[PDB]
Design a protein around this ligand. Structure first.
Ligand SMILES: COc1ccc(S(=O)(=O)N(CC(C)C)C[C@@H](O)[C@H](Cc2ccccc2)NC(=O)O[C@H]2CO[C@H]3OCC[C@H]32)cc1
Lengths: 99, 99
């Protein structure tokens, strides 16, 4: 599909058995999801943007389905105000910017 | 052009007659640029990111050319970690997401 940018590019994702709304974010190197209790091992990480840094938990090789497109990669979990699909997963679903 | 996302979507912009590098950021509602001198009037505003809120100077109806495409709109100037081009300008140059 083609998504215009009049409104936030929110799409439905499936992760850890749950459906959520997430932002297709070309400005995000990594995928950052709102706080959730995923199983498995993780490593602490700090990511920074406008306003400063937040502490997140890095999970690797997590399966995510984005608009019926399957993907698997690193997912960060922490106190983000929004679910953010970053470039590490956008590349896997064949997402491009066009103008 | 069609821009893949295996690298940061960085492009050259022109604003106030000066060239800069900026990030095409579909996850940003607004355009926020690093500290710079801009002619014209401005008003103080606050914007929130993943790490909290920052003070910025809002410039309205500013001419800005993005990868050869012209836009005229609001530009926020403040302590952002990166020059980001947000949806308010991405729409003006006809930018869409596609997968
Ligand atoms: C390492 O992996 C990372 C992944 C994501 C980020 S980030 O979130 O700080 N950022 C980065 C951008 C500011 C360069 C992505 C931007 O698209 C980021 C995503 C976001 C965070 C909080 C609330 C809404 C939207 N958007 C953002 O900061 O936009 C600003 C400017 O316009 C406003 O709309 C959204 C919030 C305001 C940082 C690191």
């Amino acid at each position: 599909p083609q998504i215009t940018l009049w409104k936030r590019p929110l799409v439905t994702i499936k992760i850890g058995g749950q459906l959520k709304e997430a932002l297709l974010d070309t400005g995000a190197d990594d995928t950052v999801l709102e706080e959730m209790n995923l199983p498995g091992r993780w490593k602490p990480k700090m990511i920074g943007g406008i306003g400063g840094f937040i502490k997140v938990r890095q999970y690797d090789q997590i399966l995510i389905e984005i608009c019926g497109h399957k993907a698997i990669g690193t997912v960060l979990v922490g106190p983000t105000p929004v679910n953010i699909i970053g470039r590490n997963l956008l590349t896997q679903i064949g997402c491009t910017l066009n103008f």
